[PDB]
């Protein structure tokens, strides 16, 4: 600990893959960055104009952000299309988030209601789907065109990935169905969480984790590596454990987000965890909040390592699973890289990270150096994750249920 006091830890073999550059020609970077297609897509929907998407693209640097979010280079044309649509979805999802953060309760209520009804309308036309203008028809009754455009764009992504995995014979039918349901349920649960943000609780530092995980749609970002690597079937043979690791990664990303955004001019507002701690249970602000966050992040890394290196030892002879788990690890570690270099958070008044590389001789020591508050945090997070009250949320974030979230955080 010194004045660069965001010191985290990650195994050397995990982080040596982020020291890596994208070996790829410029034909294939413009195949993947189909900027003209993004323009035509956002002006075929009612979202925004060319200037807005170009500004979002300059801000987010969505390509290098994507290379922090997938580790598998496209191996066929379908993978190229998947990466293209994922890039587009990321870029415009952030623009939708910039606007929905100041939505009244009624406006969000209508938005999430329309998503929930449209999902169930277009889930019975499977494998067929309506086009963008055909999908505006059921949303014509809305009083805000932005909600209509957002819903059409999200369901467009949801149907496009399905169309891609059914235009090839590699992924089985019935698991593509579960994948589609998983994606749309994630989006609907995000709307439900931002709608639950209309109340301020009737507080506890575990409800906080449960909400802050759902406040971001990071699961959809983890699914990019699944799709682009062709592991949809082997991730559907292991929907559990994979979903838990992705939840741990979401918690990781949101801890880092809440710590970066509390050092900005923009009011954090929301249920920023540092704010909640400093209201009650923190002495000096930044130095102690940073150490709490570092403990939580290190504990998430250790639990992820142990879980992966157990599920591989108890499921031997499954190389596809191994590569999938390594991809999830890559995407969980990539959030450090993203917050440090590729997002427009070049504050440097923000904590300067010290990413320590845990070598092999140190790995047994480091996995037994678990005597911290982050241990309790992550353990209790895993318990409330596998709580039977929250079984419906689990099954909805798996591809095996309908999305319902409002009866478990508002009650």
Residue numbers in the entry: -5 to 196, 198 to 406
Q: Which statements did the authors publish about this structure?
A:
Isotopic labeling studies, together with calculations, elucidate a cascade of 1,10-cyclization, 1,3-hydride shift, 1,6-cyclization, 1,2-hydride shift, 2,6-cyclization, cyclopropane ring opening, and deprotonation by the generated pyrophosphate, forming the biflorane scaffold. Our work demonstrated the mechanism of marine biflorane formation, elucidated the second crystal structure of a coral terpene synthase, and realized the terpene skeleton expansion.
The structural basis of the cyclization mechanism was studied by determining the crystal structure of PcTS1. Followed by several failure crystallization efforts with full-length PcTS1, we expressed and purified a truncated form of PcTS1, PcTS1ΔN1–5, which lacks the first five N-terminal amino acids with catalytic activity unaffected. However, it distinguishes itself with the absence of one helix (K), the elongation of two helices (H and M), and the presence of an additional helix (O) because of an insertion. PcTS1 exhibits an overall structure that closely aligns with the tFold-generated model of PcTS1, with a root-mean-square deviation of 0.94 Å for the Cα atoms. Notably, R212, D215, and S270 were identified as critical for activity.
